């Protein structure tokens, strides 16, 4: 579950977190090399377990948001791109699927935080977060 995958708005990107130290997180590159990183909570190290947005309908966590716009592309990678789209770009391409979304929560730079992990999520599969499979097959229900 929504736990073991640190979601980093630094410069890097995406982490496995093993193990806790008082100096340094062990943890691995969510990558197709997966190397062994020290980890420093300075670099903006935020759980992807907290991330969440709420919106018209419930609390919806960011995996399942990523679900509703990568439906559109049918599991391929974000044809957005964050860093070629435009401020308008960013909550447009999310109102396509959910026009929704409110402008009073919704406004911490949300949607430009999940296209950061967005890319790196179907850069290696991740695990699995949407119902067009990758891996696995999931079931909708949330």
């Known amino acids: 579950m929504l736990k073991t995958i640190l979601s980093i708005a630094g410069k890097p990107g995406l982490y496995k977190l093993i193990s806790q130290g008082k100096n340094m997180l062990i943890v691995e590159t969510v990558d197709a090399a997966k190397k062994r990183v020290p980890a420093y909570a300075h670099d903006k190290v935020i759980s992807l377990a907290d991330i969440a947005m709420y919106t018209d309908a419930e609390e919806v966590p960011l995996s399942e948001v990523l679900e509703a716009v ?70 909708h229900h949330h």
């Not at 559109?72 to 990678?77: I, M, R, S, W």
């Not at 695990?127 to 696995?136: G, H, K, N, Q, Y």
């Open 70 to 139: 990568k439906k559109k592309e049918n599991g391929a990678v974000a044809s957005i791109n964050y860093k070629k789209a435009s401020a308008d770009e960013l909550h447009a391409y999310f109102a396509e699927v959910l026009p929704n979304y409110d402008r009073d929560r919704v406004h911490n730079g949300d949607i430009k935080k999940l296209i950061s992990w967005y890319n790196i999520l179907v850069n290696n599969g991740i695990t699995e977060f949407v119902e067009a499979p990758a891996l696995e097959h999931h079931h």
